[PDB]
Design a protein around this ligand. Structure first.
Ligand code: POV
Ligand code: POV
Ligand code: POV
Ligand code: POV
Ligand code: POV
Ligand code: WEV
Ligand code: WEV
Ligand code: WEV
Ligand code: WEV
Ligand code: WEV
Ligand code: OLA
Lengths: 151, 348, 37, 204, 39, 150, 151, 150, 150, 150
């Protein structure tokens, strides 16, 4: 039943990568689409609070990685089998690299969106409907990490 | 390889400047403008385009000097919007477009200095694209072009002034030799900057900057016949950028005749069939009216590529043709001389 | 007996402290302070 | 190039060091110390199995999000002047959204086939659990990378079709054919991925 | 002894794989440069 | 039969025959499809006659699927090490040559449909160069059918 | 019961990497957003002390790594097990590289935010709202480093 | 007889003779195929006689096709390690020199049909440089036929 | 006889002599082939006289061929490790020095031919410099002959 | 005698003495030879006067040839490991020091012949600098003769 002594390396490397790679995607979507707030603030200052959605939707990317990295850190156990620990490395890469790339697309569309909404306000329902499709991508990595970590 | 990037920083601005292509007037937009009979009615037929409600506040006597000044202040606020949202690989490219107007304004700022003038020529008599509202030491430099040339090196035109010493513009060189030696150093520095940016922006833009070095190779050597500048004085005015560089510029500096520049353009089959202006006829297009049809033929071809920076320089040089075509329609209508009203360039 | 441990402890540090050293000395060599005045 | 000099400085120094090491294992007869058999058999098949599930979904949504921001900057960039784009040109977004549907389907089809065993000897772990380990790695690689390439392919065409709809509104239904041929590349990776894990059974 | 043990080869193929994921996610954040002017 | 690790090379011959020929079919459709969507605003009549550089890049996708189905069905538990090296070399030979035949369709098909929008005399010359770039993926197929079916 | 001789390497790396990479993020937040204070100072010098908010937000990133470099270094013994030190390796990476990302997001938004506040004073309530979202990325890495260091 | 992994180098000669010569025939077709579409907008008469730089790039592909069939038809299970190294170097010789010949046809076939548009006198001179850049693929063929048939 | 890995170092001398001299002969033909198309548009009389820098680059192609046939005809099943290393350094020494001779021919042949379009007296001086870049491939030939024949 | 792998390091001293002195002589005749073409347009008289940087770059090539013949004639089947380490360091000492000297000749010989186009007083000063860049290859020769002839 007792696995090798290095078996718990790959599960903590999945709990680390579920939080590290999600925080990198959430910091790109906050910094890129928060630079776009200051460019539209000078001419159209009434659309500031309405355009904080691309830094809110990039913040849900980080709580996708926090949920997985807590479930891996609670399913950790001294002497886990080598099968169970690689299940949580693949659960860390499934929500880590998902939130890295889904948080990239919230940054690029969110920076291009809040600058094109401040000139054409009809694009606000069109910007948020592309950001939704770039936010379910972070949820496809979440609900396939909930399968792998709880397998 | 430049296509899977380039929408990171420059994806919103490229779709914006291609939205301003759709506002460039078509042939059917021009055919409704040539039916106008007064400048008051040209205000009506321009409102069906995207120009609309731009002359609605000026005056009831509508003269052609207001239409020209209100058309070109609409291209400035469209260029200044795309520069204030630009990132650094593109903002360095958009500052290279304004150096053709900073050069035309620096020369205007030293003629007043040699004739002891001041900032009264700066604000009303300069192009707004290349504009000096920052670098405020230029704006108070009343010094006679020696302590002022030490301020023009605190300006982005500093790297081009390495062939003009401050004693040369102090009444030692003609005011057009100072222009074209800066413009020679401008195109050769803009051709190297457009070669470092490789990929799609180096094959959709360097054909445009090769022809711009061959326009000023042909137009300089044709207008340098009766004047007193030597063959070694116009050989340093040829930009070493174009197709004519090792061989055509060797023959163009020895021409001395219009028939000796016609048989050096016969070697290049793109420049022959452009040398059929043939102004001996009373009414037809001249040479520079046929060099303008080729400047905008290469500029339309930049919109056939997608992921490149050449879509922005080919918009400024096609919104400049809008301020030359609509004014030409307006200057044949206000004078009622509209038999040559079809001598514009039908861009789109 | 611990030869694969001590080999990989030295190798992945001395090229982790060399790449950290090379990147640092590359940035101070190419500093660009700005110097005409 | 500033940072590409670092990536090419490591890639050169890796393969120049494998050139020297490679001509020093053969040259003083130490070939026997290489042992690609010992690498493929003493590395756990749960490592290859979970680099297949980890790369089926994550490398699909890399290409699903790479194709969204390429054409989503052309919806909002091109739709400032012509705001009729934002409802007709959403099927370019869906065609690079569906390549993540093929990722999450083929990540939970592969994950149903991984089951634990208790053996540790490469003779006790037979060549059914090793074939099941390698085929899960090679099926999450042919459904993760083939959707990483399909998702950017229907984003570059979708960004060009969103800038042709801005000029002429009648052109979008004919450049939609090019996104159909581009989105068939992602379905071709799923056909190979279900055939690599068809006769796969892991466990003892 | 050898240079590598089978526990190191699994831990090195995992660490040097998500180092490639990290320097892909750090190269993008090292290149999100801001603007110079505002309007 | 063969050793325990023998099925690693036949799996990487079914992966690389489809991955590397998807990258050729994705480049041939995206590089040329950039040229279709940009010529179509100035010439909306030849928009359907110029689809054929993207259906030729799609043949590169089905050149790699013919061998990736052939390998992944003939692969069994414990093939010989000779038969798995054959199907690895049959996977790299059609994948990496479909990647070259997908590059030369993207660069020719992009430049071809721009020169056809400016001059319609190039269309018979464009679809003649595009056969020379598409038989490069066929040469990789008929040597992957030789190697895999030994 | 006892761990091997090399087992303490991975836990003193997570003590250092919690402090190294969180100070590398707090220094990017201080440098990139301290460049923006000198740009807003030349025209609007009343908002100097009020614009130290993007560099006091990066100072909390530095003490997120200081706490768990104390929580790890006080949990060190000679001969700790290889599982107990792998826990404190991912507890150092998930807070260093989360504070590294959250310092890249503080320094970019803090640069554009205080330069847009010089030309639009209504952005200051919006910039301080984005910096809350970019500061909890280091906090999500803290509460996953505490849940790993303690066990 | 030889080891079981002897067939690894023998199928890396059947692969590298085909993938490196298709990557050379792609660069000869693509890079010189943009030169045709850039010269045919002004000279539409010289289209069918400018297919010669992409025809000569297509012979570089069938040089590697011949060697990759000779290697793959001389394959058996348990071949010797000496005959396996011959066919590896027979794939690298016709492969990496056909890639060099395809690099040179692509450069002088692109730039040749640009100068042929500006002057019809370069058409005989461009062909002679195309012969010198196509015997480089022929020199790699006669070393691949010597090494593989020992 | 020698060990079983010994024949790998002799085939990689027969292959590295061919593919590195072809890469030098391609760079001398490609870079000095674009110098012909930029020269001829003003002085088309010196087209056939300007085939010399692509002829001198074509002799470097056969400096590597005459030792790739010389090494591949001294190959035997079970050559000694000393005999097998002599042919490795006979391939690396006519290749990497012929690659240098082709690198220098393509630079001075391109700049020289562009120089004789405006000054015809340079052609007897350009052809003299090409001799000096030719013998760099000849010095590698006569040292690859005294290594193979030992 | 010595071990069986001992002759590897002496062959890599015979070839590194050639291919690194031929790369120095490549950069010597190509970088200076592209300055002869720019000088020729205004001063066609001193064409034969300007082959001196190209001549002295060919002296670097025969410095590496002499050591490479001297090493390749001092080879036996079964030399000691000490003797073959002497000739590895005798090949690097004249190869990589001829690559430095040939780099220096090509840089000052390029600027020297472009400086004598505008002032012929530099010609007696251009040659005097090139002797200082010549003796760096000569210093590498007389340490290669000392190391090899022990
Ligand atoms: C051996 C020979 C190897 C190489 C020889 C050649 C190397 C020279 C290249 C220098 C690299 C460089 O330029 O730095 C760059 C990046 O710098 C950074 O920001 C840091 C990047 C991470 C490197 C850290 C290494 C530690 C690895 C330890 C791993 C531990 C992992 C634990 C978790 C500076 O950026 P830049 O100057 O702006 O360049 C862009 C310029 N541009 C914007 C104009 C395009
Ligand atoms: C260069 C390379 C020279 C090495 C290749 C020779 C191998 C063939 C010889 C052999 O039989 O295998 C040997 C091991 O061989 C090795 O262990 C070396 C492998 C190292 C990796 C090679 C990467 C090349 C990178 C390239 C970089 C390019 C970068 C561009 C991108 C084993 O030999 P043996 O078993 O002792 O002898 C057989 C005797 N018997 C038959 C009786 C058993
Ligand atoms: C440059 C940096 C390089 C640094 C390498 C320095 C490491 C020295 C360690 C010596 C250990 C050693 O193996 O000695 C070896 C000496 O072999 C040599 O010393 C050759 C030196 C290798 C450098 C090759 C670079 C030249 C490439 C151009 C002897 O090995 P052995 O005793 O013969 O073992 C084999 C015994 N068996 C055949 C029976 C299996
Ligand atoms: C640049 C220039 C590069 C050139 C550098 C060249 C340096 C290499 C020259 C050494 C070769 C000869 C030395 C020798 O004695 O023979 C040895 C060859 O053993 C080896 O090959 C040592 C290397 C092992 C693999 C390391 C790969 C790391 C690459 C990571 C790359 C990342 C790079 C990122 C930056 C024989 O070993 P042994 O007989 O088995 O005895 C060992 C004892 N043992 C048995 C207990 C294990
Ligand atoms: C930051 C840069 C610093 C990076 C340093 C990396 C080098 C560390 C290697 C040293 C520990 C190796 C080790 O203990 O192996 C363990 C694997 O445990 C692992 O998984 C090691 C993987 C290292 C990744 C580190 C990521 C940071 C298991 O030990 P073993 O090898 O399986 O036991 C065999 C017994 N023997 C070794 C006595 C034969
Ligand atoms: C001396 O204290 C400082 C302390 C340091 C080094 C470290 C910790 C305390 C800090 O790392 C902790 C983590 C955060 C915190 C709570 C800091 C308080 C900081 C000081 O206080 C804000 C400001 C101080 C400049 C600041 O106080 C201004 C005077 C100001 O008063 C101006 C206000 O208009 C401004 C809005 C307000 C905000 C910023 C708190 O503070 O500096 C300092 O060096
Ligand atoms: C057609 O087969 C040619 C070369 C081929 C196929 C293959 C190789 C074996 C080649 O690898 C080898 C080296 C043979 C070679 C290089 C021979 C010289 C040949 C001819 O001899 C110039 C010219 C030929 C171009 C000639 O017709 C030139 C026009 C010209 O003659 C014109 C002369 O004015 C110019 C002065 C002259 C020089 C060099 C004497 O080149 O090549 C060919 O025929
Ligand atoms: C104060 O920090 C806020 C939350 C923080 C600190 C912490 C974590 C849980 C958070 O880190 C995570 C990201 C919580 C999360 C994933 C969303 C929470 C969103 C809030 O709930 C919209 C908005 C939002 C209410 C508010 O910020 C704006 C006022 C606004 O509501 C104004 C609206 O006019 C605008 C339309 C609206 C958008 C959201 C619909 O944004 O902020 C906050 O309270
Ligand atoms: C379209 O694929 C065609 C054949 C294929 C696939 C050949 C491969 C197997 C090829 O792998 C290799 C190269 C063999 C080869 C040699 C083919 C020549 C083919 C044709 O040539 C007859 C071309 C066609 C170029 C040619 O026929 C032109 C019409 C032309 O005839 C026009 C002439 O004016 C021109 C001078 C002449 C010269 C250039 C050959 O070619 O047609 C084709 O059907
Ligand atoms: C056969 O190839 C020639 C030399 C080759 C290949 C030598 C190799 C064997 C080499 O291993 C070396 C370089 C032997 C060597 C060192 C020759 C030196 C000069 C040659 O002379 C002997 C010049 C020289 C005659 C001539 O080329 C020049 C025109 C000139 O005669 C005219 C003078 O104005 C000029 C100043 C003078 C200088 C340059 C020496 O030489 O030529 C050649 O043909
Ligand atoms: C065993 C430890 C070895 C690994 C440690 C690696 C940690 C790297 C830490 C810092 C490297 C960053 C230095 C580059 C400064 C960036 C300059 C800039 O971007 O302006």
């Amino acid at each position: 039943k007792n696995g090798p002594e290095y078996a718990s390396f790959f599960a903590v490397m999945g709990a680390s990568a579920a939080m590290v790679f999600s925080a990198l995607g959430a910091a790109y979507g906050t910094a890129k689409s928060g630079t776009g707030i200051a460019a539209m603030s000078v001419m159209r200052p009434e659309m500031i609070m309405k355009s904080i959605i691309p830094v809110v939707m990039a913040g849900i990317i980080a709580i996708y990685g926090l949920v997985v990295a807590v479930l891996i850190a609670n399913s950790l156990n001294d002497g886990i089998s080598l099968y169970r620990s690689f299940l949580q490395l693949g659960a860390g890469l499934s929500v880590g690299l998902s939130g890295l790339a889904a948080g990239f697309a919230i940054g690029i569309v969110g920076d291009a969106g809040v600058r094109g909404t401040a000139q054409q306000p009809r694009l606000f329902v069109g910007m948020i409907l592309i950001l939704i499709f770039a936010e379910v991508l972070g949820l496809y990595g979440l609900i396939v990490a909930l399968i792998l970590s709880t397998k | 390889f430049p296509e899977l990037y380039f929408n990171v920083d420059n994806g919103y601005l490229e779709g914006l400047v291609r939205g301003l292509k759709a506002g460039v007037l078509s042939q059917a937009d021009y055919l409704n403008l040539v039916q106008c009979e007064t400048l008051e009615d040209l205000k009506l037929h321009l409102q069906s385009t995207d120009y609309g409600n731009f002359l609605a506040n000026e005056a009831s006597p509508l003269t052609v000097s207001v239409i020209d000044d209100r058309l070109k202040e609409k291209m400035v606020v469209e260029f200044r919007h795309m520069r204030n949202h630009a990132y650094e690989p593109l903002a360095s490219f958009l500052d290279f477009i304004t150096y053709s107007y900073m050069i035309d304004n620096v020369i205007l700022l030293i003629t007043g200095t040699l004739h002891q003038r001041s900032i009264a020529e700066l604000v009303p008599k300069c192009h707004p694209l290349g504009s000096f509202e920052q670098m405020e030491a230029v704006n108070i430099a009343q010094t006679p072009a020696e302590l002022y040339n030490a301020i023009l090196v605190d300006t982005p035109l500093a790297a081009f002034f390495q062939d003009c010493i401050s004693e040369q513009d102090l009444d030692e060189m003609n005011i057009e030799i100072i222009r074209n030696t800066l413009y020679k150093a401008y195109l050769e520095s803009f051709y190297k900057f457009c070669t470092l940016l490789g990929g799609t922006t180096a094959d959709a833009m360097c054909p445009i900057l090769e022809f711009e070095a061959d326009r000023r190779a042909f137009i300089i050597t044709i207008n340098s016949f009766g004047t007193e500048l030597s063959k070694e004085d116009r050989a340093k005015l040829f930009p070493h950028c174009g197709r004519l560089y090792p061989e055509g510029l060797a023959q163009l500096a020895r021409a001395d005749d219009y028939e000796q520049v016609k048989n050096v353009a016969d070697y290049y089959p793109e420049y022959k069939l452009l040398f059929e202006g043939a102004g001996s006829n009373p009414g037809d297009k001249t040479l520079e009216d046929r060099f303008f049809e080729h400047e905008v033929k290469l500029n339309k071809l930049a919109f056939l590529n997608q992921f490149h920076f050449g879509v922005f320089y080919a918009f400024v040089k096609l919104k400049e043709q809008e301020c030359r075509n609509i004014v030409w329609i307006a200057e044949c209508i206000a004078q009622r001389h509209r038999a040559k009203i079809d001598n514009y360039i039908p861009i789109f | 007996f611990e030869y694969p441990v001590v080999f990989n402890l030295v190798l992945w540090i001395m090229i982790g402290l060399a790449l950290t050293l090379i990147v640092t000395c590359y940035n101070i060599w190419n500093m660009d302070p700005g110097y005409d005045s | 190039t500033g940072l590409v000099l670092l990536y090419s400085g490591v890639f050169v120094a890796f393969w120049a060091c494998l050139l020297v090491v490679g001509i020093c294992y053969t040259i003083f007869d130490l070939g026997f110390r290489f042992d690609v058999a010992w690498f493929l058999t003493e590395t756990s098949p749960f490592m290859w199995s979970n680099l297949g599930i980890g790369l089926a979904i994550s490398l699909s949504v890399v290409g699903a999000a790479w194709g969204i921001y390429i054409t989503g900057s052309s919806i909002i960039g091109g739709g400032v002047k012509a705001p009729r784009i934002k409802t007709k040109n959403l099927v370019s977004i869906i065609f690079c959204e569906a390549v993540a549907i093929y990722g999450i389907i083929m990540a939970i089809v592969i994950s149903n086939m991984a089951e634990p065993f208790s053996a540790t000897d490469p003779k006790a772990i037979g060549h059914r659990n090793y074939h099941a380990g390698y085929s899960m790695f090679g099926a999450g690689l042919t459904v993760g990378l083939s959707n990483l390439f399909c998702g950017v392919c229907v984003g570059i065409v979708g960004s060009g079709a969103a800038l042709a709809d801005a000029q002429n509104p009648s052109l979008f239904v004919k450049i939609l054919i090019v996104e159909i041929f581009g989105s068939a590349i992602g379905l071709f990776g799923v056909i190979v991925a279900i055939l690599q894990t068809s006769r796969v059974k892991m466990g003892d | 002894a050898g240079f590598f043990s089978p526990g190191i080869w699994m831990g090195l193929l995992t660490s040097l794989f998500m180092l490639f994921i990290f320097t892909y996610g750090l190269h993008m954040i090292l290149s999100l440069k801001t603007m110079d002017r505002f309007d």
